[PDB]
Design a protein around this ligand. Structure first.
Ligand SMILES: *[C@@H]1O[C@H](CO)[C@@H](O[C@@H]2O[C@H](CO)[C@@H](O[C@@H]3O[C@H](CO[C@H]4O[C@H](CO)[C@@H](O)[C@H](O[C@H]5O[C@H](CO)[C@@H](O)[C@H](O)[C@@H]5O)[C@@H]4O)[C@@H](O)[C@H](O[C@H]4O[C@H](CO)[C@@H](O)[C@H](O)[C@@H]4O)[C@@H]3O)[C@H](O)[C@H]2NC(C)=O)[C@H](O)[C@H]1NC(C)=O
Ligand SMILES: *[C@@H]1O[C@H](CO)[C@@H](O[C@@H]2O[C@H](CO)[C@@H](O[C@@H]3O[C@H](CO[C@H]4O[C@H](CO)[C@@H](O)[C@H](O[C@H]5O[C@H](CO)[C@@H](O)[C@H](O)[C@@H]5O)[C@@H]4O)[C@@H](O)[C@H](O[C@H]4O[C@H](CO)[C@@H](O)[C@H](O)[C@@H]4O)[C@@H]3O)[C@H](O)[C@H]2NC(C)=O)[C@H](O)[C@H]1NC(C)=O
Ligand SMILES: *[C@@H]1O[C@H](CO)[C@@H](O[C@@H]2O[C@H](CO)[C@@H](O[C@@H]3O[C@H](CO[C@H]4O[C@H](CO)[C@@H](O)[C@H](O[C@H]5O[C@H](CO)[C@@H](O)[C@H](O)[C@@H]5O)[C@@H]4O)[C@@H](O)[C@H](O[C@H]4O[C@H](CO)[C@@H](O)[C@H](O)[C@@H]4O)[C@@H]3O)[C@H](O)[C@H]2NC(C)=O)[C@H](O)[C@H]1NC(C)=O
Lengths: 125, 125, 125
């Protein structure tokens, strides 16, 4: 399903902040006693609207809210951290949750090299 | 392992309540400020004892308690939400955690279409 | 990457304590009301330095600390329980996250039995 930014305006540049699970710690800065405070753990980046991604991302986050709010209403967890790991499991289940019938449309097995390697095995005669 | 209901009685109908992660929100009812209270998020259903499922389910929940209690004794989490996602990971690991030897009993790959498609490739001569 | 114990000393024996998710409960000891207190849920074992595992394990835990501390700095969870389940998902994603090209180095499918079973199918003539 396509994404159409229907917002009054779009800031086409995303000046973002985030963290990294393993920065390049210099010396003892990785030790919590010596490391940065809560305010100094962030990295920054700047992404422009190539492929209309930024304006599409703003619209996607807007459209996601209804389903996300309905999900949070139905969970008893106070803080939800598992949405992404859940997507990864459903990703694997939708491809490998059942028997993989080679050449079927829902089986992500490419047997081309196997077939030729077996095909050219008869090329002795 | 089969399930034998050994309870003094069995209520053969399951009038159940649950939630749905995405109901058919009408208008602004998905917005938490406008939506239902904690008491009005539930849906209901009624399931009868077809295939003896309800009486078997009551016995299964009874038999599950020992293993479930022993699991909860050994975990340090105050609230456990991960039992089902854990089953899904172990489900995938038991089938795809190692090399899939085609035609072996523990490899869920059906190569039938591949074999015939290669077999009838020799039917030119 | 190899592990070289660079510690001042190594205790080459690991007298360890842990729990088991399902011990052999005798009678009603699995019932929390009747079972052991928090102090009596532990089992013990003793492992010696076969294959240099114990001294290697002490060095590994030492070397793990920097990456583990940097990970904990970047997470907003107060208590992290998901590192191992995360490794299991990444384990499956690195092998089955994309199309499995048979005979490729990143596809863990062994088609040997399939090939011979197809090869000796031509042995009628
Ligand atoms: C995702 O993105 C969409 C689109 O941007 C967001 O939609 C907005 O939804 C809210 C409802 O939650 C709307 O609020 C209502 O606004 C009306 C009128 O607002 C007027 O002023 C706006 C500010 O300038 C303007 O943008 C509006 O323009 C459009 O819409 C009108 C139709 O109303 C249309 O004729 C125009 O041509 C524009 O297309 C509009 O001029 C206001 O009257 C509402 O108030 C009543 O209802 C609420 C209950 O919802 C009640 O509390 C009030 O007391 C009052 O009774 C209400 O405030 C908002 O206007 C929408 N914005 C747009 C641009 O459509 C959506 O919210 C985003 N989702 C998330 C999760 O962020
Ligand atoms: C899963 O399902 C099973 C089966 O329904 C549940 O098993 C029950 O286990 C508990 C133990 O935790 C039992 O409690 C004990 O009951 C005895 C005697 O109970 C009598 O009265 C019952 C109520 O009517 C009746 O059902 C019983 O009937 C059967 O059993 C007797 C053998 O005792 C047999 O002869 C009959 O023919 C029936 O087959 C029985 O008539 C009671 O004396 C016990 O008390 C002592 O011990 C406890 C410690 O456990 C102590 O605290 C007391 O002070 C006292 O010293 C105890 O109360 C219960 O009887 C079992 N029910 C059945 C039907 O077998 C099991 O609990 C379920 N699991 C979960 C997690 O829910
Ligand atoms: C993983 O394993 C490694 C190796 O065991 C651990 O490394 C240790 O790192 C800490 C830093 O966090 C070091 O602390 C510093 O120690 C110096 C000097 O210590 C002296 O005394 C030690 C105790 O007997 C001895 O082991 C040391 O020996 C070696 O190192 C010297 C070089 O210094 C070398 O010449 C020798 O031949 C040995 O190889 C040494 O004799 C001390 O001066 C430091 O103090 C200053 O700096 C700190 C800031 O870090 C500051 O707070 C102080 O006030 C002071 O200004 C500091 O205490 C420790 O010595 C290292 N140990 C070894 C054996 O190398 C590492 O910690 C482990 N990781 C985890 C997570 O556990």
């Amino acid at each position: 399903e396509a994404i159409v930014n229907a917002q009054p305006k779009c800031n086409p540049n995303l000046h973002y902040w985030t963290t990294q699970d393993e920065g390049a710690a210099i010396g003892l800065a990785w030790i919590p006693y010596f490391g940065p405070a809560a305010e100094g753990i962030y990295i920054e980046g700047l992404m422009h609207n190539q492929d209309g991604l930024i304006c599409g991302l703003r619209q996607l986050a807007n459209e996601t809210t209804q389903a996300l709010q309905l999900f949070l209403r139905a969970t008893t967890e106070l803080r939800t951290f598992s949405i992404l790991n859940r997507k990864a499991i459903d990703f694997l289940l939708q491809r490998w949750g059942g028997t993989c019938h080679i050449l079927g449309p829902d089986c992500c097995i490419e047997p081309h090299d196997l077939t030729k390697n077996i095909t050219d095995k008869i090329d002795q005669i």
